[PDB]
Every structure is written in structure tokens, then in C-alpha cells.
Ligand binder design. Structure first.
Ligand SMILES: Nc1ncnc2c1ncn2[C@@H]1O[C@H](COP(=O)(O)OP(=O)(O)NP(=O)(O)O)[C@@H](O)[C@H]1O
Ligand SMILES: [Mg+2]
Length: 332
């Protein structure tokens, strides 16, 4: 009868009654995790007296108090509810966010898989702040934190005998072009044989043996990135043993989702969605071409973090971000 609606409702309920030990449940497969993070109102917004229209009453529920006018101009609220694996409020720090998003994926690369974590949302929603550090401070961002746990795990008995070497890369995608951020914005070439795997010729891999090393490459890369979006940022952590790639973690700082380059940005985001959904089961773009091998394997996991700016003036941008997020998790 209305089985489709019944399915959507059951999925919402299931997500609403899940325990944190769901995505972080080893011996259990969860290739796709979707979260949302609300940032607090900033100085400028508070000064302009922007109203905060976002509430996160539980760890999986986010509420949008959408301002509306009836035909006769009467003011009311259409309070909409969204459910995610994890919903973070304005008091959540980067370490807390990191703990429930990228942290559970590190093990995946040591188990020989390919993990990806994406920061998605509108311009100024907190994407760069979350992935790269507060602003500036590399150590306080997910790239750093993830690196920190990679060195801790590699020194664990279960992995010691792997004799792995840790490598890092940092590049940005701008208008279908790839630029090495660790090799002075050097423009790189992207090729794809017939067997279809992609290779980024010239991308520089740097050996790191310490978190301080990684922090030096993050500062360097962020210092010469094209703050503001306009590009896709992608910081990678690769594990190698003997000529072979053991595992790889690609952390992506996406461009704002809201000069007709927005066409390339929208195509990449449309492409990203279908690649992630294809993971739990085109019209290609550079981003999805470069990260292709991280969606095709069976031992691959991904996490999507949707950033939201709480201001009333950004309500339409928020709904757009949330609905995109819904469709992504829809494949889990
Ligand atoms: N959780 C947060 N707490 C405090 N400040 C934050 C937080 N998230 C973001 N900000 C700040 O708000 C701005 C948005 O930062 P980021 O620079 O994080 O945005 P995007 O990366 O969201 N923007 P864009 O590059 O235009 O797509 C920066 O000035 C951040 O320092
Ligand atoms: Mg940014």
C-alpha cells in the first residue's frame, strides 16, 4: 500500500533509537555514517541579532525551527525534524566530533581498507574549522587528531608486525584541476586507463613518523590553499609496507554547497552522493574520479559530516544541506 513511506518512517525510527555503539561497533559493517554538526552563532551574527533557529534535543535529532508566513502574513513555525547517526550541538568541540566520525574509521585502514570522511555544508558552516583546525591551529582539527591515532595504533601489538610506513598528501581540486598543496600548488595531471583505475601523476607523498610531522605538512598545505571554499581540500593518510598500499584514509574539506564554477561544484556534489550511495550496494567529476578507488572496494567505509550555520538568515541553506544528507544516509 504505502510501503515506501513505511520504510522511510522505520529508517527514521531505527536511527532515532540507536546507541553510539552502532557505527563504532566492530565485528559489524557500517560503510556509511552520516552526522550533522551545528556551530554556534558567531559575533557578527549575534551583533546583527540573528536568531538561532536550530535545536538538537538529543544525540541523533536535529530540529529546524523554520520561520514562515501564512498567506495573511501571520507568523508561525514549521519545526522540522531530522535524525542522524550523530547530531552535535553548538557546545560540541572538535575532539568530541572527531571521536564519533573519523576516529571509528582509522582502524579500517589498518585492516587494509579505504576510508573517507567528508565535511559538507554551506559557506561559513564550519567545514575548514573542523577538518583543519580552529579558524589555523592544525593540532585541533580532524586531520591532526586522525594522524595522532594512526601513530598510536601502528605501535600496537596487533599491528606492530605489519611493519608499515606512514605517508601523507595534501591536494586541492579547483575547476576540474588538481593542485599539490605540499608541492607549491603545482598543477597535476589525472589519467585513467581502460581498466579504469585513476592515478594522479606527480602527487607528492611525504613520510611522517610523528604527529608533529603531520602538523607541519597541514600548516604548509593550508598556508597555500585557494579562508574560503572555491576548492575541494583533501588531506590523505596512507599506509605502506612493501611496494604495496596497505590502507588509505582521505579526509575531505568540501567547497560550499550553496564565476559559473558552481556548476563544477554542484556536479561534484551530485557525483559524490551517487558514489557514496553506490558504496552501500554518474556524470563524473574530478573529485569522484580521484577518490574512485575509495568507493569501489568492498572493504571501504565513509563518514559524512553535515555542517550547519544556526542563523535564521541561513535557513534555506540549512534545509538544502540537511536534505542532501538525508539522501546520503538513505543508503544505509
Ligand atoms: N564549532 C565552531 N566553533 C567556533 N567557531 C566556529 C565553529 N565552526 C566554525 N567556526 C568559525 O566560523 C567560520 C567558518 O569557518 P570554516 O572557515 O570553518 O568555514 P567553511 O569552511 O564552513 N566556510 P567556506 O570555506 O566559506 O565554505 C570561521 O571563522 C570559524 O573559525
Ligand atoms: Mg572552508
Amino acid at each position: 500500500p504505502n510501503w515506501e513511506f513505511a520504510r522511510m518512517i522505520k529508517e527514521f525510527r531505527v536511527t532515532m533509537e540507536c546507541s553510539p555503539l552502532t557505527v563504532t561497533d566492530p565485528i559489524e559493517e557500517h560503510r556509511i555514517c552520516v552526522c550533522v554538526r551545528k556551530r554556534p552563532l558567531n559575533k557578527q551574527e549575534l551583533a546583527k541579532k540573528e536568531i538561532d533557529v536550530i535545536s538538537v534535543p538529543s544525540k541523533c535529532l536535529l530540529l529546524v525551527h523554520e520561520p514562515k508566513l501564512k498567506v495573511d502574513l501571520t507568523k508561525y513555525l514549521e519545526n522540522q525534524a531530522f535524525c542522524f547517526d550523530f547530531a552535535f550541538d553548538e557546545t560540541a568541540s572538535n575532539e568530541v566530533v572527531y571521536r564519533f566520525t573519523a576516529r571509528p574509521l582509522v582502524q579500517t585502514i589498518f585492516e587494509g581498507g579505504k576510508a573517507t570522511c567528508f565535511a559538507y555544508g554551506q559557506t561559513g558552516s564550519g567545514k575548514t574549522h573542523t577538518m583543519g583546525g580552529d579558524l589555523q591551529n592544525a593540532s585541533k582539527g580532524i586531520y591532526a587528531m586522525a594522524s595522532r591515532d594512526v601513530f598510536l595504533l601502528k605501535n600496537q601489538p596487533r599491528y606492530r608486525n605489519l611493519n608499515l610506513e606512514v605517508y601523507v598528501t595534501f591536494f586541492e581540486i579547483y575547476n576540474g584541476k588538481v593542485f599539490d598543496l605540499l608541492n607549491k600548488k603545482a598543477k597535476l595531471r589525472v589519467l585513467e586507463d581502460s581498466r579504469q583505475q585513476v592515478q594522479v601523476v606527480g602527487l607528492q607523498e611525504y613520510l611522517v613518523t610523528c604527529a608533529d610531522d603531520v602538523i607541519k605538512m597541514i600548516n604548509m598545505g593550508s598556508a597555500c590553499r585557494t579562508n574560503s571554499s572555491r576548492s575541494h581540500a583533501c588531506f590523505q593518510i596512507l599506509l605502506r609496507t612493501k611496494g604495496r598500499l596497505h590502507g588509505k584514509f582521505s579526509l575531505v574539506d568540501l567547497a560550499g554547497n550553496e564565476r559559473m564554477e558552481g556548476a563544477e561544484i554542484n556536479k561534484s556534489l551530485l557525483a559524490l552522493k551517487e558514489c557514496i550511495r553506490a558504496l552501500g550496494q554518474f556524470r563524473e567529476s574530478k573529485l569522484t574520479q580521484v577518490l574512485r578507488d575509495s568507493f569501489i572496494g568492498e572493504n571501504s567505509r565513509t563518514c559524512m559530516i553535515a555542517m550547519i550555520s544556526p542563523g535564521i538568515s541561513s535557513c534555506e541553506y540549512t534545509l538544502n544541506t540537511l536534505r542532501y544528507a538525508d539522501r546520503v544516509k538513505e543508503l544505509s
